[PDB]
Design a protein around this nucleic acid. Sequence first.
RNA 1: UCCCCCGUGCCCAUAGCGGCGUGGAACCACCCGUUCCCAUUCCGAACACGGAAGUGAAACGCGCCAGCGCCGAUGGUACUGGGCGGGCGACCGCCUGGGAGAGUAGGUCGGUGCGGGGGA
RNA 2: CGAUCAACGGAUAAAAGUUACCCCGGGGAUAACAGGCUGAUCUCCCCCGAGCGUCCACAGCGGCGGGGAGGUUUGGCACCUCGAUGUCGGCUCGUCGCAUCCUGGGGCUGAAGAAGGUCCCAAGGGUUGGGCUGUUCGCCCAUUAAAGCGGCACGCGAGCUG
RNA 3: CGCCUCCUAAAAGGUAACGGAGGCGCCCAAAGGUCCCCUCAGGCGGGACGGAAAUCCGCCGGAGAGCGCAAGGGUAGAAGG
RNA 4: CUGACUGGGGCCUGUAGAGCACUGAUAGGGCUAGGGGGCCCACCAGCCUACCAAACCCUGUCAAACUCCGAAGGGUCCCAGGUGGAGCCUGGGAGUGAGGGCGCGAGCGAUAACGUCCGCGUCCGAGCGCGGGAACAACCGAGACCGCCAGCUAAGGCCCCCAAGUCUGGGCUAAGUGGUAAAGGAUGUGGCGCCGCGAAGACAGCCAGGAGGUUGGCUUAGAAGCAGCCAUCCUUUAAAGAGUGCGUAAUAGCUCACUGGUCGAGUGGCGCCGCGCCGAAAAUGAUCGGGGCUUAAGCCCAGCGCCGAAGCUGCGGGUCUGGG
Lengths: 141, 110, 203, 77
Amino acid sequence: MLMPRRMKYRKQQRGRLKGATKGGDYVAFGDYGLVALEPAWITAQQIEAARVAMVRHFRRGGKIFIRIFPDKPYTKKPLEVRMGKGKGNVEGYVAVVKPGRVMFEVAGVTEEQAMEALRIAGHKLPIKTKIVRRDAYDEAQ
Amino acid sequence: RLTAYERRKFRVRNRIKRTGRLRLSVFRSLKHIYAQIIDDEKGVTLVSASSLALKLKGNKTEVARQVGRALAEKALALGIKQVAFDRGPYKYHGRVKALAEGAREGGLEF
Amino acid sequence: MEYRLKAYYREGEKPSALRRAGKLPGVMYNRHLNRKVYVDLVEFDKVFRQASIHHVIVLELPDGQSLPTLVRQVNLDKRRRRPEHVDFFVLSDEPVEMYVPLRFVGTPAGVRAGGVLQEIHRDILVKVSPRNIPEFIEVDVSGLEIGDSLHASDLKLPPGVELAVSPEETIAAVVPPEDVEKLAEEAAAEVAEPEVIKKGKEE
Amino acid sequence: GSTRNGRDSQAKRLGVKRYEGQVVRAGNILVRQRGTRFKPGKNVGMGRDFTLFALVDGVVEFQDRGRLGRYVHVRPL
RNA sequence: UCCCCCGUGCCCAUAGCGGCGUGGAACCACCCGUUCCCAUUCCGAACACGGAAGUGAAACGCGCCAGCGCCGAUGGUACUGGGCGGGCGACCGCCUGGGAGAGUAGGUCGGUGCGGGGGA
RNA sequence: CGAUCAACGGAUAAAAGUUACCCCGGGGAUAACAGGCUGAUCUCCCCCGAGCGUCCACAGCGGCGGGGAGGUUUGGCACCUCGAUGUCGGCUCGUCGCAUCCUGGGGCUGAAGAAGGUCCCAAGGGUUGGGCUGUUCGCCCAUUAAAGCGGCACGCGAGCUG
RNA sequence: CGCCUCCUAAAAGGUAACGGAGGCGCCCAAAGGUCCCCUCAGGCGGGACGGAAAUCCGCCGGAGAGCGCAAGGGUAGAAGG
RNA sequence: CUGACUGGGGCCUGUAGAGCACUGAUAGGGCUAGGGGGCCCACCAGCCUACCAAACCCUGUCAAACUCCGAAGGGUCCCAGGUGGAGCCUGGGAGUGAGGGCGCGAGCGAUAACGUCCGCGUCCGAGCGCGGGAACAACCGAGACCGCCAGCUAAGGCCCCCAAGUCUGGGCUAAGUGGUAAAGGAUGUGGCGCCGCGAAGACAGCCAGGAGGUUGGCUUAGAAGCAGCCAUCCUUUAAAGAGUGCGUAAUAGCUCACUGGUCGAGUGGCGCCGCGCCGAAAAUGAUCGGGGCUUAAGCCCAGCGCCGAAGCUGCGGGUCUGGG
Ligand SMILES: CC(=O)[C@H]1O[C@@H](OC2=CCC(/C=C(\C)C(=O)N[C@@H]3[C@H](O)[C@@H](O)[C@H]4OCO[C@H]4[C@@H]3O)=CC2=O)[C@@H](O)[C@@H]1O
Ligand SMILES: NC(=[NH2+])NCCC[C@H](N)C(=O)O
Ligand SMILES: [Mg+2]
Ligand SMILES: [Mg+2]
Ligand SMILES: [Mg+2]
Ligand SMILES: [Mg+2]
Ligand SMILES: [Mg+2]
Ligand SMILES: [Mg+2]
Ligand SMILES: [Mg+2]
Ligand SMILES: [Mg+2]
Ligand SMILES: [Mg+2]
Ligand SMILES: [Mg+2]
Ligand SMILES: [Mg+2]
Ligand SMILES: [Mg+2]
Ligand SMILES: [Mg+2]
Ligand SMILES: [Mg+2]
Ligand SMILES: [Mg+2]
Ligand SMILES: [Mg+2]
Ligand SMILES: [Mg+2]
Ligand SMILES: [Mg+2]
Ligand SMILES: [Mg+2]
Ligand SMILES: [Mg+2]
Ligand SMILES: [Mg+2]
Ligand SMILES: [Mg+2]
Ligand SMILES: [Mg+2]
Ligand SMILES: [Mg+2]
Ligand SMILES: [Mg+2]
Ligand SMILES: [Mg+2]
Ligand SMILES: [Mg+2]
Ligand SMILES: [Mg+2]
Ligand SMILES: [Mg+2]
Ligand SMILES: [Mg+2]
Ligand SMILES: [Mg+2]
Ligand SMILES: [Mg+2]
Ligand SMILES: [Mg+2]
Ligand SMILES: [Mg+2]
Ligand SMILES: [Mg+2]
Ligand SMILES: [Mg+2]
Ligand SMILES: [Mg+2]
Ligand SMILES: [Mg+2]
Ligand SMILES: [Mg+2]
Ligand SMILES: [Mg+2]
Ligand SMILES: [Mg+2]
Ligand SMILES: [Mg+2]
Ligand SMILES: [Mg+2]
Ligand SMILES: [Mg+2]
Ligand SMILES: [Mg+2]
Ligand SMILES: [Mg+2]
Ligand SMILES: [Mg+2]
Ligand SMILES: [Mg+2]
Ligand SMILES: [Mg+2]
Ligand SMILES: [Mg+2]
Ligand SMILES: [Mg+2]
Ligand SMILES: [Mg+2]
Ligand SMILES: [Mg+2]
Ligand SMILES: [Mg+2]
Ligand SMILES: [Mg+2]
Ligand SMILES: [Mg+2]
Ligand SMILES: [Mg+2]
Ligand SMILES: [Mg+2]
Ligand SMILES: [Mg+2]
Ligand SMILES: [Mg+2]
Ligand SMILES: [Mg+2]
Ligand SMILES: [Mg+2]
Ligand SMILES: [Mg+2]
Ligand SMILES: [Mg+2]
Ligand SMILES: [Mg+2]
Ligand SMILES: [Mg+2]
Ligand SMILES: [Mg+2]
Ligand SMILES: [Mg+2]
Ligand SMILES: [Mg+2]
Ligand SMILES: [Mg+2]
Ligand SMILES: [Mg+2]
Ligand SMILES: [Mg+2]
Ligand SMILES: [Mg+2]
Ligand SMILES: [Mg+2]
Ligand SMILES: [Mg+2]
Ligand SMILES: [Mg+2]
Ligand SMILES: [Mg+2]
Ligand SMILES: [Mg+2]
Ligand SMILES: [Mg+2]
Ligand SMILES: [Mg+2]
Ligand SMILES: [Mg+2]
Ligand SMILES: [Mg+2]
Ligand SMILES: [Mg+2]
Ligand SMILES: [Mg+2]
Ligand SMILES: [Mg+2]
Ligand SMILES: [Mg+2]
Ligand SMILES: [Mg+2]
Ligand SMILES: [Mg+2]
Ligand SMILES: [Mg+2]
Ligand SMILES: [Mg+2]
Ligand SMILES: [Mg+2]
Ligand SMILES: [Mg+2]
Ligand SMILES: [Mg+2]
Ligand SMILES: [Mg+2]
Ligand SMILES: [Mg+2]
Ligand SMILES: [Mg+2]
Ligand SMILES: [Mg+2]
Ligand SMILES: [Mg+2]
Ligand SMILES: [Mg+2]
Ligand SMILES: [Mg+2]
Ligand SMILES: [Mg+2]
Ligand SMILES: [Mg+2]
Ligand SMILES: [Mg+2]
Ligand SMILES: [Mg+2]
Ligand SMILES: [Mg+2]
Ligand SMILES: [Mg+2]
Ligand SMILES: [Mg+2]
Ligand SMILES: [Mg+2]
Ligand SMILES: [Mg+2]
Ligand SMILES: [Mg+2]
Ligand SMILES: [Mg+2]
Ligand SMILES: [Mg+2]
Ligand SMILES: [Mg+2]
Ligand SMILES: [Mg+2]
Ligand SMILES: [Mg+2]
Ligand SMILES: [Mg+2]
Ligand SMILES: [Mg+2]
Ligand SMILES: [Mg+2]
Ligand SMILES: [Mg+2]
Ligand SMILES: [Mg+2]
Ligand SMILES: [Mg+2]
Ligand SMILES: [Mg+2]
Ligand SMILES: [Mg+2]
Ligand SMILES: [Mg+2]
Ligand SMILES: [Mg+2]
Ligand SMILES: [Mg+2]
Ligand SMILES: [Mg+2]
Ligand SMILES: [Mg+2]
Ligand SMILES: [Mg+2]
Ligand SMILES: [Mg+2]
Ligand SMILES: [Mg+2]
Ligand SMILES: [Mg+2]
Ligand SMILES: [Mg+2]
Ligand SMILES: [Mg+2]
Ligand SMILES: [Mg+2]
Ligand SMILES: [Mg+2]
Ligand SMILES: [Mg+2]
Ligand SMILES: [Mg+2]
Ligand SMILES: [Mg+2]
Ligand SMILES: [Mg+2]
Ligand SMILES: [Mg+2]
Ligand SMILES: [Mg+2]
Ligand SMILES: [Mg+2]
Ligand SMILES: [Mg+2]
Ligand SMILES: [Mg+2]
Ligand SMILES: [Mg+2]
Ligand SMILES: [Mg+2]
Ligand SMILES: [Mg+2]
Ligand SMILES: [Mg+2]
Ligand SMILES: [Mg+2]
Ligand SMILES: [Mg+2]
Ligand SMILES: [Mg+2]
Ligand SMILES: [Mg+2]
Ligand SMILES: [Mg+2]
Ligand SMILES: [Mg+2]
Ligand SMILES: [Mg+2]
Ligand SMILES: [Mg+2]
Ligand SMILES: [Mg+2]
Ligand SMILES: [Mg+2]
Ligand SMILES: [Mg+2]
Ligand SMILES: [Mg+2]
Ligand SMILES: [Mg+2]
Ligand SMILES: [Mg+2]
Ligand SMILES: [Mg+2]
Ligand SMILES: [Mg+2]
Ligand SMILES: [Mg+2]
Ligand SMILES: [Mg+2]
Ligand SMILES: [Mg+2]
Ligand SMILES: [Mg+2]
Ligand SMILES: [Mg+2]
Ligand SMILES: [Mg+2]
Ligand SMILES: [Mg+2]
Ligand SMILES: [Mg+2]
Ligand SMILES: [Mg+2]
Ligand SMILES: [Mg+2]
Ligand SMILES: [Mg+2]
Ligand SMILES: [Mg+2]
Ligand SMILES: [Mg+2]
Ligand SMILES: [Mg+2]
Ligand SMILES: [Mg+2]
Ligand SMILES: [Mg+2]
Ligand SMILES: [Mg+2]
Ligand SMILES: [Mg+2]
Ligand SMILES: [Mg+2]
Ligand SMILES: [Mg+2]
Ligand SMILES: [Mg+2]
Ligand SMILES: [Mg+2]
Ligand SMILES: [Mg+2]
Ligand SMILES: [Mg+2]
Ligand SMILES: [Mg+2]
Ligand SMILES: [Mg+2]
Ligand SMILES: [Mg+2]
Ligand SMILES: [Mg+2]
Ligand SMILES: [Mg+2]
Ligand SMILES: [Mg+2]
Ligand SMILES: [Mg+2]
Ligand SMILES: [Mg+2]
Ligand SMILES: [Mg+2]
Ligand SMILES: [Mg+2]
Ligand SMILES: [Mg+2]
Ligand SMILES: [Mg+2]
Ligand SMILES: [Mg+2]
Ligand SMILES: [Mg+2]
Ligand SMILES: [Mg+2]
Ligand SMILES: [Mg+2]
Ligand SMILES: [Mg+2]
Ligand SMILES: [Mg+2]
Ligand SMILES: [Mg+2]
Ligand SMILES: [Mg+2]
Ligand SMILES: [Mg+2]
Ligand SMILES: [Mg+2]
Ligand SMILES: [Mg+2]
Ligand SMILES: [Mg+2]
Ligand SMILES: [Mg+2]
Ligand SMILES: [Mg+2]
Ligand SMILES: [Mg+2]
Ligand SMILES: [Mg+2]
Ligand SMILES: [Mg+2]
Ligand SMILES: [Mg+2]
Ligand SMILES: [Mg+2]
Ligand SMILES: [Mg+2]
Ligand SMILES: [Mg+2]
Ligand SMILES: [Mg+2]
Ligand SMILES: [Mg+2]
Ligand SMILES: [Mg+2]
Ligand SMILES: [Mg+2]
Ligand SMILES: [Mg+2]
Ligand SMILES: [Mg+2]
Ligand SMILES: [Mg+2]
Ligand SMILES: [Mg+2]
Ligand SMILES: [Mg+2]
Ligand SMILES: [Mg+2]
Ligand SMILES: [Mg+2]
Ligand SMILES: [Mg+2]
Ligand SMILES: [Mg+2]
Ligand SMILES: [Mg+2]
């Protein structure tokens, strides 16, 4: 599942989660999108869960666009150790996501299929979401 | 993309102007040789001398020497004595050398 | 078609006041003029969803003028997903670069075969005269299988309109569908851990 | 459990030491730097470690000459 | 004090790439030679000297063209010094002063100082 | 000129261990207990509805993921206590919580009946004797309506045991 | 455990943790002084043995090469040859 | 007179933000080396690819150790304001070198800790003196020289405990929400927008009908609209999907979308905002500080008045410093 093929640095500092999303705020590929309403580190496991739930709803058909990528290494100390003695080990990868980011888009599917696949996908994510349809506002960006 | 010609010219001239003397610049064409003493602080030429301006005659080396004497005679008259020689793209040799040796005979100090 | 929208002039009114009065701040320009305007947001929304950046909007200014415009730019509040400002570009007699809709006529054979028609471009950038704006540009996609594509070179353009993009720019593609039968392969798939780019004496 | 890092060198206190308009004396250091981030201009020398220093009493003046670089001059009083 | 050219600066691509066109009287270049000065890790290509039959082909200069490159508002927004509020938090707002970046309209096939030769 | 005086401002020219036989001065400036803050881990409860259940997502189940509660586990932290806050287990004596083991009242069932399963209400009372082991726990024997799980400084040593 | 480079470091300087990454304890008689000359990597095309890459030719190519060694800064109008 | 602080002016900077031109990352598509695999060959070529995919490009993004950009600020010098328990110089005497909470910016930790480690600020330390916050070092208010049975305010308050409004106007809530919590769930309530469908008679109710090809096609072990598929086509019609949901092992059957009659005016579906509901279990006796409160004594919006400290004022006094 998603993670960088290679990287310059093994561990990243934690950073902040302030502000509206930086880009990716308009539908770019398909007909409908799933928009983040609150900030989070979405894991790679969560992205894959949202993805599999969407192809499973479609069974055979449609196209899913995943517009977030987890390049941020997630670190955790081994259980029961004290503070100190260096940074914890990389245990996973997360995509930073801020309000307004279009995380997923779908195409090649009916409106009922897209509304439902995107809804189920939303239940796999640790944040509130919103389903949107491509507008002329999207097309003008 | 610069030529070996332009790099050579920039090279010898940056070193000259760093000393802050009035510079004796020399341009050598296939036919003629020209000299002007330039104040790089004001970007202004103080005095000139050309084989073209003097309508000078035959052997290029002997011509160059005489425009050197010519530049000196006009230079001293204005008060200019010390100077830095600017061979620009040319080797200190031949026509350029002759012009330098002719300027020195007139008492230009370099 | 051709749509109309009342606009108004503004000077020192703070944008946040205009937006709280339900008005949308905007600007109006070309090589000759530049004016600060505003439009009623509810009214502008009704037009813009019909006339995108594609169709002419004529602004009825309160001074009695009537200027033909294209919307050149719509700035969105990235959080709330709402328009916060509009550029109206006022057209002249000279030609103009602009986006003309694409109409994908036909059902691709690949789409009959199970595929999906990925509409990579939904409009196309074009130099054309304002007296000359086509409503759309038809493209036949019925011959595309999985996975063929069309480019702006394959575009049959009406009279007086010329491509303003590289004819190698791709405009449509028919790709394979999502398939549950793929899932189990992807679940049991193995991905060796990421490599860290070597630094120092080790390079 | 142990760290292979934990090393860093002392800070070197680099940067410009006299800004435009400041009255300096000959020998005053104007810029501490690694390489020629600034170049010596009129009445300014440069030492083996790229340090710019004033060659005369006077006033510091900076000049940004685009692709030719940024320069520090000392205008005599 | 105007136009062309030749030197030499300054601004530091609005000055660049590319395409086309143009100039040899003058100037510049290529050019003609390699005796002489000087020269090639081989080569008169370069550097250099002595020349003056030819050509503006190359180069250089000067024009035109916006395909690229470069520059680029206005408006709006992000962010923010200072002042205030809100949320359990992740974080979110308001006031006052400041205010990008991206993008849009557009701009650009340079401007200018000093000396020299020529022209009117 | 002679320094891995590298513990690199370099105590001597010259130096390792052990103490449950231990001692003094100090510290809650700092650990082991208990409490506290926290809740990763732990226990419990939910959201989503892939898929199972012949048929049928939801009788009983719940892939991949998502949200919480509690403060009984193991820890994190080091905040009162080191001019002392006695420790496991048992016995004795209780008392409380309810996420209920039984008894009482219910809905659903893939509930014929009888017997079950699952969830809801419910803390009034009740919740056995023995073999093993210091044990808590657990396994086993014989029963039982049932042989509940937790808190009270892992309740209770100025109450006993040891 | 001293020293160097980058980050953390909140656009002067400085700034901690058993925070995130690397290096030093040398070397060079030229790899130093000065004078003179020269300009890269890379792409494409062409060339016996000859290859992805040996050496040659042409075109494009402002610096992505090089600068003994880490990293950074600097740098061809040279600090590179 | 040089100070903190401030005004103007110049220079220095690479953070916030943003960007992708460099260094890396990155999804998809295009294009296209090289591989895989498939035809065809060993005579050395050739073609096919819904396979992995370099370079390049397009769309769309990510970065403390990336930057084509780049603030607000900050630093420093000059001129000016600034006479302050300001500043500078020399010397005598120290104490301190366990900090801590909070706000903001980061690292570590788990986007844990009354956690830990730096930065800017602040308070406590030393203001455990005073008002407010039920109580409470550091939250809000405010820097206590002494005295007064005088006055004004601050935060916070004005139904009673308890000093001052059971003050005024508009709205919301019915949950004692207020008076601790999340995903998520819901014909709770109110205010908005947006579709439709309807007096060319809607919705609801009642009333009929809802049909031949079709026990249909992948199909056999059942698959007959309604166990999965690579299908939705006709026919008679007012109308009718080879079918919404229920049922059969199959079938049938009910009944939906569906059309006609019946009444006679609304009806169904979205989306957004305010306030509430559930989700909500822990251990001695409960409780918002208590009582008690419902067109509030709750919440939102707008006001007038008052109460309220050791702050400020009036009066009197002390001491030190400065000026007479
Ligand atoms: C006793 C003293 O004199 C002083 O010390 C203080 O008290 C205590 C100190 C330590 C202590 C427990 C220790 C060291 C321990 O290791 N305990 C574990 C475990 O936790 C325990 O539960 C048992 O488990 C099975 O065996 C034990 C096991 O060794 C218990 C105390 O009460 C102070 O208040 C007293 O005055
Ligand atoms: N004027 C300013 N500096 N504003 C700073 C804005 C920061 C504040 N948290 C806000 O979002 O409003
Ligand atoms: Mg951190
Ligand atoms: Mg996480
Ligand atoms: Mg972590
Ligand atoms: Mg441990
Ligand atoms: Mg650590
Ligand atoms: Mg960690
Ligand atoms: Mg993880
Ligand atoms: Mg985001
Ligand atoms: Mg969710
Ligand atoms: Mg964009
Ligand atoms: Mg709208
Ligand atoms: Mg180590
Ligand atoms: Mg470190
Ligand atoms: Mg060290
Ligand atoms: Mg230091
Ligand atoms: Mg340091
Ligand atoms: Mg440093
Ligand atoms: Mg500096
Ligand atoms: Mg030196
Ligand atoms: Mg040196
Ligand atoms: Mg200046
Ligand atoms: Mg100067
Ligand atoms: Mg010229
Ligand atoms: Mg000038
Ligand atoms: Mg050109
Ligand atoms: Mg011509
Ligand atoms: Mg030309
Ligand atoms: Mg000629
Ligand atoms: Mg001629
Ligand atoms: Mg010879
Ligand atoms: Mg001879
Ligand atoms: Mg020759
Ligand atoms: Mg020559
Ligand atoms: Mg000749
Ligand atoms: Mg020519
Ligand atoms: Mg030339
Ligand atoms: Mg033009
Ligand atoms: Mg600029
Ligand atoms: Mg711009
Ligand atoms: Mg602006
Ligand atoms: Mg602020
Ligand atoms: Mg804000
Ligand atoms: Mg502001
Ligand atoms: Mg402002
Ligand atoms: Mg900015
Ligand atoms: Mg801009
Ligand atoms: Mg140009
Ligand atoms: Mg010029
Ligand atoms: Mg001149
Ligand atoms: Mg002139
Ligand atoms: Mg002239
Ligand atoms: Mg010794
Ligand atoms: Mg070492
Ligand atoms: Mg030591
Ligand atoms: Mg020692
Ligand atoms: Mg040392
Ligand atoms: Mg000693
Ligand atoms: Mg010694
Ligand atoms: Mg000795
Ligand atoms: Mg020893
Ligand atoms: Mg020793
Ligand atoms: Mg001993
Ligand atoms: Mg012993
Ligand atoms: Mg022993
Ligand atoms: Mg013994
Ligand atoms: Mg003994
Ligand atoms: Mg003894
Ligand atoms: Mg013994
Ligand atoms: Mg003893
Ligand atoms: Mg003792
Ligand atoms: Mg002692
Ligand atoms: Mg003692
Ligand atoms: Mg303690
Ligand atoms: Mg200590
Ligand atoms: Mg302890
Ligand atoms: Mg202890
Ligand atoms: Mg302990
Ligand atoms: Mg412990
Ligand atoms: Mg323990
Ligand atoms: Mg205890
Ligand atoms: Mg403890
Ligand atoms: Mg205690
Ligand atoms: Mg306790
Ligand atoms: Mg706690
Ligand atoms: Mg918890
Ligand atoms: Mg908790
Ligand atoms: Mg947990
Ligand atoms: Mg729950
Ligand atoms: Mg469910
Ligand atoms: Mg099944
Ligand atoms: Mg069922
Ligand atoms: Mg199923
Ligand atoms: Mg369930
Ligand atoms: Mg599970
Ligand atoms: Mg969780
Ligand atoms: Mg959990
Ligand atoms: Mg506890
Ligand atoms: Mg405990
Ligand atoms: Mg612990
Ligand atoms: Mg504990
Ligand atoms: Mg610990
Ligand atoms: Mg402790
Ligand atoms: Mg302690
Ligand atoms: Mg501490
Ligand atoms: Mg103790
Ligand atoms: Mg005592
Ligand atoms: Mg005591
Ligand atoms: Mg005692
Ligand atoms: Mg134990
Ligand atoms: Mg008990
Ligand atoms: Mg219960
Ligand atoms: Mg019962
Ligand atoms: Mg019962
Ligand atoms: Mg029964
Ligand atoms: Mg039965
Ligand atoms: Mg039975
Ligand atoms: Mg039952
Ligand atoms: Mg139930
Ligand atoms: Mg129930
Ligand atoms: Mg009971
Ligand atoms: Mg009881
Ligand atoms: Mg009981
Ligand atoms: Mg026995
Ligand atoms: Mg026995
Ligand atoms: Mg026993
Ligand atoms: Mg036992
Ligand atoms: Mg026994
Ligand atoms: Mg056991
Ligand atoms: Mg066993
Ligand atoms: Mg029995
Ligand atoms: Mg029973
Ligand atoms: Mg028993
Ligand atoms: Mg207990
Ligand atoms: Mg315990
Ligand atoms: Mg224990
Ligand atoms: Mg105990
Ligand atoms: Mg116990
Ligand atoms: Mg006890
Ligand atoms: Mg005892
Ligand atoms: Mg005991
Ligand atoms: Mg006791
Ligand atoms: Mg006792
Ligand atoms: Mg006792
Ligand atoms: Mg006692
Ligand atoms: Mg005993
Ligand atoms: Mg014993
Ligand atoms: Mg040191
Ligand atoms: Mg720093
Ligand atoms: Mg820094
Ligand atoms: Mg700094
Ligand atoms: Mg300093
Ligand atoms: Mg360490
Ligand atoms: Mg090392
Ligand atoms: Mg040598
Ligand atoms: Mg090459
Ligand atoms: Mg080749
Ligand atoms: Mg070959
Ligand atoms: Mg080759
Ligand atoms: Mg380099
Ligand atoms: Mg190395
Ligand atoms: Mg003053
Ligand atoms: Mg000052
Ligand atoms: Mg000052
Ligand atoms: Mg100031
Ligand atoms: Mg940033
Ligand atoms: Mg990039
Ligand atoms: Mg871009
Ligand atoms: Mg970032
Ligand atoms: Mg970024
Ligand atoms: Mg950084
Ligand atoms: Mg940055
Ligand atoms: Mg810019
Ligand atoms: Mg500034
Ligand atoms: Mg700073
Ligand atoms: Mg400043
Ligand atoms: Mg300052
Ligand atoms: Mg300033
Ligand atoms: Mg002053
Ligand atoms: Mg003082
Ligand atoms: Mg003082
Ligand atoms: Mg004084
Ligand atoms: Mg003193
Ligand atoms: Mg004294
Ligand atoms: Mg004394
Ligand atoms: Mg001390
Ligand atoms: Mg001391
Ligand atoms: Mg100390
Ligand atoms: Mg200390
Ligand atoms: Mg301490
Ligand atoms: Mg501290
Ligand atoms: Mg500390
Ligand atoms: Mg803090
Ligand atoms: Mg702090
Ligand atoms: Mg705040
Ligand atoms: Mg914060
Ligand atoms: Mg902070
Ligand atoms: Mg940090
Ligand atoms: Mg959590
Ligand atoms: Mg602390
Ligand atoms: Mg904290
Ligand atoms: Mg913290
Ligand atoms: Mg502090
Ligand atoms: Mg103290
Ligand atoms: Mg205070
Ligand atoms: Mg204080
Ligand atoms: Mg206090
Ligand atoms: Mg206190
Ligand atoms: Mg008090
Ligand atoms: Mg207080
Ligand atoms: Mg109080
Ligand atoms: Mg009170
Ligand atoms: Mg308090
Ligand atoms: Mg406290
Ligand atoms: Mg006072
Ligand atoms: Mg009053
Ligand atoms: Mg008040
Ligand atoms: Mg009250
Ligand atoms: Mg009262
Ligand atoms: Mg009031
Ligand atoms: Mg009232
Ligand atoms: Mg309730
Ligand atoms: Mg209540
Ligand atoms: Mg309550
Ligand atoms: Mg909720
Ligand atoms: Mg909710
Ligand atoms: Mg509702
Ligand atoms: Mg509502
Ligand atoms: Mg069928
Ligand atoms: Mg039927
Ligand atoms: Mg509730
Ligand atoms: Mg009212
Ligand atoms: Mg008062
Ligand atoms: Mg008073
Ligand atoms: Mg007072
Ligand atoms: Mg008085
Ligand atoms: Mg005094």
